């Protein structure tokens, strides 16, 4: 049932993810150093800024994404950026000790590190629960990259002009995901997997909303906004 077109889509997204996710985390050496006051804000702001660039690189390779206007590409990335970053971070998350392990002790981030960047349990608690629930899905990488692509091209994002085209692109990805699970994910792990994955997209919307609140509060203070990056300020707001 998985058409030739649908395997091609999966192959592109798998390649797009491999070209934009460095599992060695080598570039983390270029960030401002972590310090363990919002002592982790400079380092984690650099990390998020680095992640935005990777998310843009991935989005540019989603089939159909380039057929959107520049305005629609921008609003989709602006709205989805923090969700895809949280999604992508699941690859580094470990349930061994509920942390994001990016290759070394310096680049291992726990709830204390996120709190030392300015965020509170109102975000961090549902964030950890999201990372655990996503991990418990044990997605195929095929499912992981499809979920990221579907996240980005959502027609209900604020500011979308051409919602009909956005929905068309997303529908092709969703049908690809549904068919992949049916034909390639064996039971019992396949049980209601598509519904559970869409529920995770709903979770990300709520995490996005709470991150926006805390970011607005954080960035409202110039002492904090000084520690952000230009790209982060452009994407998330001033």
């Amino acid at each position: 049932k998985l058409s030739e077109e649908q395997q091609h889509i999966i192959a592109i997204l798998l390649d797009a993810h491999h070209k934009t996710y460095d599992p060695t985390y080598a570039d983390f050496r270029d960030f401002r150093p972590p310090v363990r006051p919002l002592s982790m804000l400079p380092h984690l702001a650099d990390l998020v800024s680095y992640s935005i660039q990777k998310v843009i690189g991935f989005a540019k390779m989603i089939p159909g994404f380039r057929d959107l206007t520049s305005d629609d590409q921008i609003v989709l990335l602006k709205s989805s950026a923090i969700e895809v970053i949280m999604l992508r971070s699941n690859q580094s998350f470990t349930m061994d000790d509920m942390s994001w392990d990016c290759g070394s002790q310096d680049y291992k981030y726990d709830v204390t590190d996120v709190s030392k960047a300015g965020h509170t349990l109102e975000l961090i608690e549902p964030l950890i629960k999201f990372q655990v629930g996503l991990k418990k899905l044990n997605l195929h990488e095929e499912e992981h990259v499809l979920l990221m692509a579907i996240c980005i091209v959502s027609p209900d994002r604020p500011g979308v002009q051409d919602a009909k085209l956005v929905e068309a692109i997303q529908d092709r990805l969703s049908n690809t995901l549904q068919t992949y699970i049916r034909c390639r994910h064996p039971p019992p792990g396949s049980h209601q997997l598509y519904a559970k994955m869409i529920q995770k997209l709903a979770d990300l919307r709520s995490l996005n909303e709470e991150h926006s609140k805390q970011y607005r509060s954080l960035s409202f203070q110039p002492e904090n906004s000084m520690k952000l990056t230009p790209l982060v300020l452009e994407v998330f707001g001033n």
């Binding site: 843009i56 540019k60 230009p230 790209l231 994407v235």
Partner: peptide, 10 residues
């Protein structure tokens, strides 16, 4: 409005 986003999208 979004020059850095635009340039990365190029």
């Amino acid at each position: 409005n979004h020059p850095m986003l635009m340039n990365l999208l190029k």
